[PDB]
Design an enzyme around this catalytic site. Sequence first.
Site, PDB file in Angstrom:
ATOM      1  N   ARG A   1      -0.344   7.670   2.123  1.00 43.21           N
ATOM      2  CA  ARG A   1       0.273   8.781   2.906  1.00 43.21           C
ATOM      3  C   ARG A   1       0.623   8.425   4.362  1.00 43.21           C
ATOM      4  O   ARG A   1      -0.127   8.728   5.291  1.00 43.21           O
ATOM      5  CB  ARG A   1      -0.667   9.994   2.881  1.00 43.21           C
TER       6      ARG A   1
ATOM      7  N   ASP B   1       0.832  -1.228   0.000  1.00 46.45           N
ATOM      8  CA  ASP B   1       0.000   0.000   0.000  1.00 46.45           C
ATOM      9  C   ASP B   1       0.849   1.254   0.000  1.00 46.45           C
ATOM     10  O   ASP B   1       1.863   1.347   0.670  1.00 46.45           O
ATOM     11  CB  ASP B   1      -1.040   0.032   1.111  1.00 46.45           C
ATOM     12  CG  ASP B   1      -2.239  -0.854   0.800  1.00 46.45           C
ATOM     13  OD1 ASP B   1      -2.337  -1.342  -0.355  1.00 46.45           O
ATOM     14  OD2 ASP B   1      -3.088  -1.085   1.693  1.00 46.45           O
TER      15      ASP B   1
ATOM     16  N   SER C   1       6.945   5.138  -7.995  1.00 46.56           N
ATOM     17  CA  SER C   1       6.319   5.328  -9.304  1.00 46.56           C
ATOM     18  C   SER C   1       6.590   6.662  -9.919  1.00 46.56           C
ATOM     19  O   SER C   1       6.827   7.661  -9.240  1.00 46.56           O
ATOM     20  CB  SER C   1       4.805   5.145  -9.283  1.00 46.56           C
ATOM     21  OG  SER C   1       4.151   6.305  -8.817  1.00 46.56           O
ATOM     22  N   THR C   2       6.503   6.674 -11.235  1.00 45.38           N
ATOM     23  CA  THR C   2       6.563   7.947 -12.012  1.00 45.38           C
ATOM     24  C   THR C   2       5.514   9.000 -11.498  1.00 45.38           C
ATOM     25  O   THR C   2       5.775  10.208 -11.405  1.00 45.38           O
ATOM     26  CB  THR C   2       6.405   7.721 -13.539  1.00 45.38           C
ATOM     27  OG1 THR C   2       5.299   6.861 -13.785  1.00 45.38           O
ATOM     28  CG2 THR C   2       7.674   7.073 -14.161  1.00 45.38           C
ATOM     29  N   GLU C   3       4.342   8.519 -11.126  1.00 47.81           N
ATOM     30  CA  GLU C   3       3.284   9.432 -10.633  1.00 47.81           C
ATOM     31  C   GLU C   3       3.536   9.951  -9.209  1.00 47.81           C
ATOM     32  O   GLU C   3       3.006  10.986  -8.800  1.00 47.81           O
ATOM     33  CB  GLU C   3       1.893   8.792 -10.653  1.00 47.81           C
ATOM     34  CG  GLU C   3       1.272   8.649 -12.038  1.00 47.81           C
ATOM     35  CD  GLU C   3       1.989   7.563 -12.798  1.00 47.81           C
ATOM     36  OE1 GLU C   3       2.522   7.928 -13.871  1.00 47.81           O
ATOM     37  OE2 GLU C   3       2.115   6.391 -12.275  1.00 47.81           O
ATOM     38  N   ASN C   4       4.342   9.196  -8.468  1.00 55.12           N
ATOM     39  CA  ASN C   4       4.715   9.573  -7.101  1.00 55.12           C
ATOM     40  C   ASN C   4       5.484  10.882  -7.045  1.00 55.12           C
ATOM     41  O   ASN C   4       5.550  11.523  -6.036  1.00 55.12           O
ATOM     42  CB  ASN C   4       5.509   8.454  -6.401  1.00 55.12           C
ATOM     43  CG  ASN C   4       4.635   7.278  -6.014  1.00 55.12           C
ATOM     44  OD1 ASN C   4       5.091   6.139  -6.038  1.00 55.12           O
ATOM     45  ND2 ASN C   4       3.361   7.547  -5.654  1.00 55.12           N
TER      46      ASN C   4
ATOM     47  N   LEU D   1      -3.580  -1.992  -9.900  1.00 51.34           N
ATOM     48  CA  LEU D   1      -2.164  -2.213 -10.289  1.00 51.34           C
ATOM     49  C   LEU D   1      -1.246  -1.010 -10.113  1.00 51.34           C
ATOM     50  O   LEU D   1      -0.025  -1.127  -9.988  1.00 51.34           O
ATOM     51  CB  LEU D   1      -2.070  -2.724 -11.717  1.00 51.34           C
ATOM     52  CG  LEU D   1      -2.697  -4.119 -11.904  1.00 51.34           C
ATOM     53  CD1 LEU D   1      -2.386  -4.623 -13.316  1.00 51.34           C
ATOM     54  CD2 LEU D   1      -2.212  -5.118 -10.864  1.00 51.34           C
TER      55      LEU D   1
HETATM   56  C1  LIG Z   1      10.633   1.910   1.161  1.00 53.58           C
HETATM   57  C2  LIG Z   1      10.518   2.412  -0.258  1.00 53.58           C
HETATM   58  C3  LIG Z   1      11.766   2.752  -1.009  1.00 53.58           C
HETATM   59  C4  LIG Z   1       9.323   2.561  -0.887  1.00 53.58           C
HETATM   60  C5  LIG Z   1       7.987   2.221  -0.233  1.00 53.58           C
HETATM   61  C6  LIG Z   1       7.093   1.563  -1.270  1.00 53.58           C
HETATM   62  C7  LIG Z   1       5.815   1.009  -0.698  1.00 53.58           C
HETATM   63  C8  LIG Z   1       5.859   0.225   0.592  1.00 53.58           C
HETATM   64  C9  LIG Z   1       4.653   1.227  -1.360  1.00 53.58           C
HETATM   65  C10 LIG Z   1       4.619   2.051  -2.647  1.00 53.58           C
HETATM   66  C11 LIG Z   1       3.837   1.347  -3.721  1.00 53.58           C
HETATM   67  C12 LIG Z   1       3.660   2.209  -4.972  1.00 53.58           C
HETATM   68  C13 LIG Z   1       4.812   2.861  -5.653  1.00 53.58           C
HETATM   69  C14 LIG Z   1       2.461   2.370  -5.505  1.00 53.58           C
HETATM   70  C15 LIG Z   1       1.231   1.706  -4.899  1.00 53.58           C
HETATM   71  O1  LIG Z   1       0.125   2.580  -5.111  1.00 53.58           O
HETATM   72  P1  LIG Z   1      -1.229   2.404  -4.302  1.00 53.58           P
HETATM   73  O2  LIG Z   1      -0.882   1.639  -2.990  1.00 53.58           O
HETATM   74  O3  LIG Z   1      -2.071   1.533  -5.190  1.00 53.58           O
HETATM   75  O4  LIG Z   1      -1.686   3.855  -4.132  1.00 53.58           O
END
Ligand SMILES: CC(C)=CCC/C(C)=C\CC/C(C)=C\COP(=O)(O)O
EC number: 2.5.1.-
Lengths: 205, 208
Positions: free
Chosen positions: A15, A12, A41-44, A162
Amino acid sequence: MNELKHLAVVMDGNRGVKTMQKLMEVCMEENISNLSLFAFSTENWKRPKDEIDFIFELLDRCLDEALEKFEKNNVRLRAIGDLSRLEDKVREKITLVEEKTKHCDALCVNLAISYGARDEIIRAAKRVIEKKLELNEENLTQNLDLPLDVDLMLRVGNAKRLSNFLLWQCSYAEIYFSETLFPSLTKREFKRIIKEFRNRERTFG
Amino acid sequence: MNELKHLAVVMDGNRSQGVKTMQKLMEVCMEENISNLSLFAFSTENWKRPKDEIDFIFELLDRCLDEALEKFEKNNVRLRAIGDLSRLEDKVREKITLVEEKTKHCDALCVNLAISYGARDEIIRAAKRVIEKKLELNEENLTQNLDLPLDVDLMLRVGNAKRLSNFLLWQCSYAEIYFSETLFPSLTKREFKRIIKEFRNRERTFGK
Ligand SMILES: CC(C)=CCC/C(C)=C\CC/C(C)=C\COP(=O)(O)O
Ligand SMILES: CC(C)=CCC/C(C)=C\CC/C(C)=C\COP(=O)(O)O
């Protein structure tokens, strides 16, 4: 009956680590060659700047852990994504850890950083063009950051989607939504989920 | 809170009312202001199915095309075909084109029918169109050149299969996904509406 060659996990994005080692440990006992993980992600990139520096702070701690423990444990690290968006500091550390571990045989951790499936596909399309190859499913596939089809796509959390992760690779991926508020999970429930996978019918159309 | 403009549906493809349940889904879409309804009939991989199975599917598809020739335009429902239609027998292609033309102007609901369709193939075809148009190869341009440019808000699987099976992958990047384990027949308006309500209250960040 079903071979699990490539497992993709996302957690997940709303925030701790134990779940990750248990994760890697299991892929190994199970002869799972490719573990794919979604970090950024690119959108992040559109998140609030505070949330971001915080995530890269975590990431950095993860990469350090990789350096120390990956090689001796015979684990490989590969970074997929548009890596040019990244600061040089991280980028270098990444490059380093990839080089250090390039020769590890027992598992391959594909880490998705500044990654998006649509971007990947676009970049792959271009790779194809600049090699003067015919645009087709096969040539495109082979020019992805990660050509390998996903077998089991595993969501650890409550989100049902996804979120732009390995879309192309997932066309026939088995999907599994494992609910939780806390990215938690047990060695056995992993093995449980896996077992489930091996038995369910895959027709590939 | 969440708006649902584009509903996609796929049913288990392995092992009447169906027509009746479908009307209910279409009525629910209208009542709910869902402008686009996307259905998965036949895929590019389905061509590797035994010839007898393919035969039966096109037999029915035909039946459905007739219903649509009958019932569609008088209900203000538009029909659009997507997929690689060039792989289809002549009789089919023309009959598709026919109902398409007859319903081209229909305002109330747009039924997107995926036939001899695959996401990967759609994606390749979109990239060539972009190239053929001398456009820059980027996300926006590829999107706009898809057979179906519209993002999927909700991807509904009806069956026990847990997977997208080459169905609108690009469009689904941020699509909410829902597995209802039932046959299509067994679905009620109340249930469709509920699922819809559920989707509306789900947190959608699109990566924030
Ligand atoms: C610790 C680290 C480098 C990154 C944390 C990544 C984690 C735990 C989740 C991010 C998952 C991503 C990029 C997208 C998921 O989107 P959503 O959960 O569907 O809004
Ligand atoms: C009635 C008609 C013309 C077509 C029926 C389509 C049905 C019921 C199933 C096919 C769905 C497709 C194309 C893919 C799903 O495959 P899967 O369930 O993931 O193996």
